[PDB]
Coordinates of C-alpha atoms and ligand atoms in Angstrom, one line a residue:
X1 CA 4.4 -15.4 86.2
X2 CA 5.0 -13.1 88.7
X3 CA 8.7 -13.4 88.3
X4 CA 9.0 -11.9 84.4
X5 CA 7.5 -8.7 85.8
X6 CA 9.8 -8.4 88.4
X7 CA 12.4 -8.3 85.6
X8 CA 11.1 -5.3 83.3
X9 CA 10.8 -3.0 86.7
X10 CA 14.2 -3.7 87.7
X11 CA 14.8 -3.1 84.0
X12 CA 12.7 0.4 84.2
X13 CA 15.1 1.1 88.1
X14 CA 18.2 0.6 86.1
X15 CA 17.0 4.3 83.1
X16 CA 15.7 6.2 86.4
X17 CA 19.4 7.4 86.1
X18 CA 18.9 9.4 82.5
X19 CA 15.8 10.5 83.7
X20 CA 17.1 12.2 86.4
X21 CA 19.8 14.0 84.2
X22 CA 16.7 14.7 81.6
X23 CA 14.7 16.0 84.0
X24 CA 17.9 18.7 84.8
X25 CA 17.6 19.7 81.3
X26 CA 13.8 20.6 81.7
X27 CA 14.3 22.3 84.6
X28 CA 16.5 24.9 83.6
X29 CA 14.6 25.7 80.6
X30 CA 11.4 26.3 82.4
X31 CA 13.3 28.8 86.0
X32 CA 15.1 30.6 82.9
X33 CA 11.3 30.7 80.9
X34 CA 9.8 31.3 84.6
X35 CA 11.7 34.8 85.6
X36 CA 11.1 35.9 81.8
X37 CA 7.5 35.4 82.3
X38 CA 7.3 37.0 85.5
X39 CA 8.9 40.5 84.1
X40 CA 5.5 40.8 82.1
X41 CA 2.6 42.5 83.5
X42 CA -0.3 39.7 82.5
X43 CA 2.4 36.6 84.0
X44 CA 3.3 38.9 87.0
X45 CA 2.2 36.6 89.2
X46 CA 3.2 33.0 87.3
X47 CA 4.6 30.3 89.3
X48 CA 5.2 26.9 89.1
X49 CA 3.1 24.1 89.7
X50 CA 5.0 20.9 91.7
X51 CA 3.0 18.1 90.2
X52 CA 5.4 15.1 89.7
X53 CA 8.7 13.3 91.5
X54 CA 11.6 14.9 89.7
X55 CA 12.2 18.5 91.9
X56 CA 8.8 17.7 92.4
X57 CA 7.8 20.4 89.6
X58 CA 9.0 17.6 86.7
X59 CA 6.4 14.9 85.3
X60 CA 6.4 12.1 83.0
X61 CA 4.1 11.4 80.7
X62 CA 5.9 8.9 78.3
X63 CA 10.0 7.4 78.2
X64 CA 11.1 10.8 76.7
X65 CA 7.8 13.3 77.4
X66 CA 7.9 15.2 80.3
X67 CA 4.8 17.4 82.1
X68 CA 5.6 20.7 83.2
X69 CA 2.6 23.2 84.7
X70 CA 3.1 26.5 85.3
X71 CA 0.2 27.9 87.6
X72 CA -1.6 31.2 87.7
X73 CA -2.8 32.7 91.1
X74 CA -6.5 34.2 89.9
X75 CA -8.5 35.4 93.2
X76 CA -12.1 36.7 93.1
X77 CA -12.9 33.7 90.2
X78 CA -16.6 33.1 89.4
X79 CA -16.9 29.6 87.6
X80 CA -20.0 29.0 85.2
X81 CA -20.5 25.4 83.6
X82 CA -20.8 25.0 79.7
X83 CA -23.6 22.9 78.4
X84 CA -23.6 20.2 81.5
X85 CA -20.3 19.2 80.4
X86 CA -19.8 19.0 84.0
X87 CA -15.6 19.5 83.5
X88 CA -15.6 22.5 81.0
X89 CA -16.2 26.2 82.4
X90 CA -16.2 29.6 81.5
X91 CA -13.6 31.9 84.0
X92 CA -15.8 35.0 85.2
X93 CA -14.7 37.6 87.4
X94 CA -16.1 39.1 90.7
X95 CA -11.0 45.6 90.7
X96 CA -7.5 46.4 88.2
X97 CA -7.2 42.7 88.1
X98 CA -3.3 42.2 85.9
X99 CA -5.1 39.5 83.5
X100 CA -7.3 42.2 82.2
X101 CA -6.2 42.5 78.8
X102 CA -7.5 38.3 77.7
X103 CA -11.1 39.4 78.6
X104 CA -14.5 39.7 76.5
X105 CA -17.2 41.2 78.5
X106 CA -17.0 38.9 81.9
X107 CA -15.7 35.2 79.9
X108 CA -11.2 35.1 80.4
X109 CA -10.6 34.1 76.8
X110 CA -8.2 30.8 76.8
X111 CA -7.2 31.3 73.3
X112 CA -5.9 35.0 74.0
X113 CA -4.0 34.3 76.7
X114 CA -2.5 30.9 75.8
X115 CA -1.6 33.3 72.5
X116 CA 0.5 35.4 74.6
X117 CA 2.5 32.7 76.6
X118 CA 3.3 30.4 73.6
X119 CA 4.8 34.3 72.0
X120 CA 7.3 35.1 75.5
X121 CA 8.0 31.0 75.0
X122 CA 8.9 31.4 71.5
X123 CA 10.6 34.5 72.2
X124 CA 13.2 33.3 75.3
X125 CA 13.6 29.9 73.3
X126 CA 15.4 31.3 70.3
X127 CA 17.2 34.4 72.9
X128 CA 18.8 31.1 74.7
X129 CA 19.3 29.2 71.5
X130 CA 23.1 27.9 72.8
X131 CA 21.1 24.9 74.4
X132 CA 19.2 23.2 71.8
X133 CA 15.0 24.1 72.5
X134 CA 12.9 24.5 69.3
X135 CA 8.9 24.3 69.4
X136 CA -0.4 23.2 75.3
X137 CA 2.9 24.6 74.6
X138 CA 5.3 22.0 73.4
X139 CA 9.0 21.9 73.2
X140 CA 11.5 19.4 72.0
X141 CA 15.1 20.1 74.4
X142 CA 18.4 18.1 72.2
X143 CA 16.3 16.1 69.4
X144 CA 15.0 13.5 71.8
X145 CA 13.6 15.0 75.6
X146 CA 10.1 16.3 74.6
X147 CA 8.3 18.5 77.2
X148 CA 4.7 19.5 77.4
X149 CA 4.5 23.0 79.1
X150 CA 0.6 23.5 80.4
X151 CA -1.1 27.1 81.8
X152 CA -3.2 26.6 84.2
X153 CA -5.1 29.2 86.5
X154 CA -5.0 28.6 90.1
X155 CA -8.2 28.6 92.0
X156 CA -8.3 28.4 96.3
X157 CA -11.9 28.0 96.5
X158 CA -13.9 25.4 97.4
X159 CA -14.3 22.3 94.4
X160 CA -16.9 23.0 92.0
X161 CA -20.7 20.7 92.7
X162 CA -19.3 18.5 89.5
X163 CA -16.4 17.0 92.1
X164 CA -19.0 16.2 95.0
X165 CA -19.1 12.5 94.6
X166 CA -15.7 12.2 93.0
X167 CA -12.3 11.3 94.4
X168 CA -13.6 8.3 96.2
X169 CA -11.6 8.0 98.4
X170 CA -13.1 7.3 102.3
X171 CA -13.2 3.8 102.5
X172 CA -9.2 2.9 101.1
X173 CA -7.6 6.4 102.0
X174 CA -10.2 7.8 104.8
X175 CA -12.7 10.6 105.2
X176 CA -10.6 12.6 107.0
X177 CA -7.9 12.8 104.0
X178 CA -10.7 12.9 101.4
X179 CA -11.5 16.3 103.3
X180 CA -7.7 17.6 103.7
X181 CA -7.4 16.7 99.8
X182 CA -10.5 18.9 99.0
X183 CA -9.5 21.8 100.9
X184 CA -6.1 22.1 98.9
X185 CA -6.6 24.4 95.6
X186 CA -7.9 23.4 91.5
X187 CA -6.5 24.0 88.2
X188 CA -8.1 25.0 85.4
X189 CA -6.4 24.2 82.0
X190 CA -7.7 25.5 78.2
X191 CA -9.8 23.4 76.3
X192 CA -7.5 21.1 73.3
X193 CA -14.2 25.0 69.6
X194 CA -15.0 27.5 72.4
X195 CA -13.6 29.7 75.3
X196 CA -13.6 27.3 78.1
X197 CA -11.4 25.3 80.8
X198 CA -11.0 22.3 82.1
X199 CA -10.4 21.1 85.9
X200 CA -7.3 19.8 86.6
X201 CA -6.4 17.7 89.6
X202 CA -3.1 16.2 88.2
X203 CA -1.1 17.8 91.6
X204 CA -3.3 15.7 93.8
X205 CA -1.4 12.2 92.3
X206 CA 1.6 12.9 94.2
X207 CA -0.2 13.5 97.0
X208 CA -1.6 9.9 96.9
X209 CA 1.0 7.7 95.1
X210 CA 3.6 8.6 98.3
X211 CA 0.5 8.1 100.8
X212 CA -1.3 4.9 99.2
X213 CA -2.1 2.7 101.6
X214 CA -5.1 1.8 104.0
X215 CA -2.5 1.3 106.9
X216 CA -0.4 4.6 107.0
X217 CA 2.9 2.2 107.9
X218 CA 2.5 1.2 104.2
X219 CA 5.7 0.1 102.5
X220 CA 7.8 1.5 105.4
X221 CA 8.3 -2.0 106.6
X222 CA 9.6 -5.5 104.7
X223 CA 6.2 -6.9 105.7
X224 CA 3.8 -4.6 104.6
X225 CA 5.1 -4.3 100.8
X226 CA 2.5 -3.2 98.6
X227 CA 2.2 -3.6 95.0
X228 CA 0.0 -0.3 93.9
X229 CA 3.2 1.7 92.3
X230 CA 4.4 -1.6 90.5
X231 CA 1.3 -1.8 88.9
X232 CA 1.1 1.4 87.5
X233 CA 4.9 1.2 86.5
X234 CA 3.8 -1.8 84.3
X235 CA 0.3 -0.6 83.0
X236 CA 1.7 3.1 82.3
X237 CA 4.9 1.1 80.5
X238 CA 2.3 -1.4 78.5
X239 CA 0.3 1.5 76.9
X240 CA 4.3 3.4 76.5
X241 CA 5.3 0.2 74.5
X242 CA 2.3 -0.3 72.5
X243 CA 2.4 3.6 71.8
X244 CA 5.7 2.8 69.8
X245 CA 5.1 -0.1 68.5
X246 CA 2.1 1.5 66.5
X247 CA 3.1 4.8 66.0
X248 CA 2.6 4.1 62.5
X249 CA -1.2 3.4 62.3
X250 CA -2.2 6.8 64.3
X251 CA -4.9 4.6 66.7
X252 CA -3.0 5.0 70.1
X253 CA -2.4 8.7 69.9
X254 CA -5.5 10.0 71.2
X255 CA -4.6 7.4 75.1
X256 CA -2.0 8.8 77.2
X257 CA -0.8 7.9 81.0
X258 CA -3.5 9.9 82.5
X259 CA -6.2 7.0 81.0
X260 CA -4.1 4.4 82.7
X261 CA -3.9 6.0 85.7
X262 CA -7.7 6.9 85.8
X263 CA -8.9 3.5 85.3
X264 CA -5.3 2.2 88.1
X265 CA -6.6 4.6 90.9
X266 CA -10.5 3.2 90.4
X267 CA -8.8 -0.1 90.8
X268 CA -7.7 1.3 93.9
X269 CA -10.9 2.5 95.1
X270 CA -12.2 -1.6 93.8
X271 CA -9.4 -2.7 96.2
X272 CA -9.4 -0.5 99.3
X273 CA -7.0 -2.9 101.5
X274 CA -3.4 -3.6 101.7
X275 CA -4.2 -7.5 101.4
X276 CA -5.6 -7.0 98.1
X277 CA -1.9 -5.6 96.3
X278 CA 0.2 -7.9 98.2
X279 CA 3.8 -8.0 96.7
X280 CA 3.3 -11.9 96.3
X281 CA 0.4 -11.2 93.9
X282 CA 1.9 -8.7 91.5
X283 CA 1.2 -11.1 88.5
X284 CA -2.8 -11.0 89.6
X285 CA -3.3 -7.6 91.2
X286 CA -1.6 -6.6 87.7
X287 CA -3.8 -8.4 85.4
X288 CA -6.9 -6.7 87.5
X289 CA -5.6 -3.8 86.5
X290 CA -5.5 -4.9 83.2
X291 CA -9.2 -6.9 83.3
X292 CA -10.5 -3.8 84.6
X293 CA -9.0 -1.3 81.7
X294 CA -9.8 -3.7 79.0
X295 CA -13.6 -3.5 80.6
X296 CA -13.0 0.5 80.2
X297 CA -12.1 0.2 76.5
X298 CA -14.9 -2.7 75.3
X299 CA -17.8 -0.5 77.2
X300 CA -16.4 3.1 76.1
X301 CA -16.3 4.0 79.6
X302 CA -14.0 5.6 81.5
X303 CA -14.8 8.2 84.8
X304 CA -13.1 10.7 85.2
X305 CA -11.4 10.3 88.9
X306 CA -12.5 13.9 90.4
X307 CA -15.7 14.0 88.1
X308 CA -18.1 11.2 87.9
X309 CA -20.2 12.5 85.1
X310 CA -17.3 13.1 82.3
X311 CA -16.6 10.3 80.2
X312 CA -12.2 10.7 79.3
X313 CA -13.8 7.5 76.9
X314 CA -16.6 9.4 75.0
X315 CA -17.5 8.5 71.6
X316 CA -16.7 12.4 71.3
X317 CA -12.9 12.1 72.8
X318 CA -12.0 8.9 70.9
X319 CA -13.3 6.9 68.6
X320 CA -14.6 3.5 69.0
X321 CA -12.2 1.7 66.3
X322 CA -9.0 3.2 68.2
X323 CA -10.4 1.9 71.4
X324 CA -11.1 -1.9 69.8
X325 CA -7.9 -1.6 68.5
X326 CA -6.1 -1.1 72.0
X327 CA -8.9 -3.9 73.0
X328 CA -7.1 -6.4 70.7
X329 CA -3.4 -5.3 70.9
X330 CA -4.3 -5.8 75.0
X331 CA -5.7 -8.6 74.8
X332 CA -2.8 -10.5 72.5
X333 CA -0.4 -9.2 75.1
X334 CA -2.3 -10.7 78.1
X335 CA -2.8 -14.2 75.8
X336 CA 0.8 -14.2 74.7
X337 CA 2.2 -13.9 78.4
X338 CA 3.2 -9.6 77.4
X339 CA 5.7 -10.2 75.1
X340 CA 6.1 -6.1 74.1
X341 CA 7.9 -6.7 78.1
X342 CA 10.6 -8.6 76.5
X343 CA 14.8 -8.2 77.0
Ligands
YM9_401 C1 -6.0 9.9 92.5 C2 -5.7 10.7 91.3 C3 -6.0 10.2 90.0 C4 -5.7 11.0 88.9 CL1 -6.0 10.3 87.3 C5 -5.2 12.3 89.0 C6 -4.9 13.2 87.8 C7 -5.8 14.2 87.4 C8 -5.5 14.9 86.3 C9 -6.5 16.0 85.9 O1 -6.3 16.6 84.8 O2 -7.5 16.2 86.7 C10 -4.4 14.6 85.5 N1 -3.9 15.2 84.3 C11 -2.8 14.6 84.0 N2 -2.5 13.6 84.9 C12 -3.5 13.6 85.8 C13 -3.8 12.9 87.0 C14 -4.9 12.8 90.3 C15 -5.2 12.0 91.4 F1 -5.0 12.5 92.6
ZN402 ZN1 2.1 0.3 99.7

């Protein structure tokens, strides 16, 4: 029951230890990579982007990945949509703007200036070479901590018209923090072929994971415990586990975290009171979680959390025999009482 996943997150408390230590090792890499970007003219104004727990500029994305973002202050930003994508955009300008040199008419080429940060990364990784770092940008620190470096540019105006009925927030979280959240600034990121980027809300999670609750006295007090966190400790862990237990057949590598915690957070938006994640009901507010990604995977759909119209489960972002393959290895696991959770 309820008690077996108590277990593997005590288990998971006990490795928060050498993640800690892990997440030291990341961030002196990036402050050394940090003041060697900033001594260029294009990355003159490069700063980082506090997105996670860890110094709260450290992510993680897997038991050794880790999420770093490294932001981009770009006023006077004009944003034009690609081909009703409704997430993908061209960066137009509006002066002697610093990011000059990556343009092609009006359109900021992402290609050109993701060219020129991987280059002073490669560069400052091999000057520092007496601390074990070889090679968006990726980087592998001692043969086992793997950290995925991200550009993004940093826009302070209002969310673009795509975002207008995303982020659902008013009736768990309130209309009142719905607003605050929107009037905070956007990221965009390159595309993973054309000259466009993405919108990128990732520094909004910690925003709401340490603020979840209907009732702001919300796991401040014995007895109003929630269960939210727990249950995307457990369904971020499932997908970790399954990850590496089929790293061999190539079908898991296109789901990551961020499609657990997509289709966790709509759960959240399903569930909008406290009552409904009781600590008592871990075992069933768990397998909702789980009953409601499996739904995600069988119907090929999965909303983005800020924008509505993108599909993160398109036929065009995975394919449909990686997702039935997840859809069975799930399913096994929920009809064999999880036992890829066993010690
Ligand atoms: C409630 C909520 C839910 C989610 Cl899913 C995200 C979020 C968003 C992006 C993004 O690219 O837009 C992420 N990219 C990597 N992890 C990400 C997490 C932020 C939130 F505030
Ligand atoms: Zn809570």
């Amino acid at each position: 029951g309820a008690s077996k996943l108590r277990a593997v997150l005590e288990k998971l408390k006990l490795s928060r230890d050498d993640i800690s230590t892990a997440a030291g090792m990341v961030k002196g890499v990036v402050d050394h990579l940090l003041l060697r970007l900033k001594c260029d003219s294009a990355f003159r104004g490069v700063g980082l982007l506090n997105t996670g727990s860890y110094y709260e500029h450290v992510k993680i994305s897997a038991p050794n990945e880790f999420d770093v973002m490294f932001k981009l202050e770009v006023p006077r930003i004009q944003l034009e949509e690609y081909s009703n994508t409704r997430a993908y955009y061209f960066v137009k300008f509006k002066k002697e703007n610093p990011l000059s040199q990556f343009l092609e008419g009006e359109i900021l080429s992402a290609s050109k200036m993701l060219s020129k940060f991987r280059k002073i990364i490669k560069e400052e990784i091999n000057d520092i070479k007496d601390t074990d770092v070889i090679m968006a940008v990726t980087l592998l620190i001692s043969e086992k901590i793997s950290v995925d470096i991200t550009l993004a540019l940093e826009s302070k105006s209002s969310w673009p018209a795509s975002t207008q009925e995303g982020l659902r927030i008013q009736n768990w979280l309130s209309a009142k923090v719905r607003k605050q959240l929107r009037l905070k600034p956007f990221y965009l990121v390159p595309k993973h072929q054309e000259e466009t980027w993405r919108l990128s809300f990732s520094h909004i999670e910690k925003e709401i994971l340490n603020n979840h609750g209907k009732s702001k006295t919300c796991c401040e007090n014995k007895e109003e415990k929630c269960c939210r966190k727990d249950c995307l400790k457990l369904m971020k862990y499932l997908l970790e586990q399954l990850k590496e237990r089929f790293k061999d057949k190539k079908h898991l590598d296109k789901f990551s975290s961020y499609h657990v915690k997509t289709a966790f957070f709509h759960v959240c938006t399903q569930n909008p009171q406290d009552s409904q994640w009781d600590r008592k009901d871990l075992g069933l507010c768990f397998d909702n979680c789980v009953t409601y990604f499996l739904q995600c995977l069988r119907t090929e759909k999965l909303e983005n959390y800020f924008i509505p119209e993108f599909n993160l489960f398109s036929s065009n972002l995975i394919d449909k025999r990686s997702k039935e393959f997840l859809t069975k290895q799930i399913e096994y696991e929920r009809n064999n009482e999880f036992p890829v959770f066993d010690e």
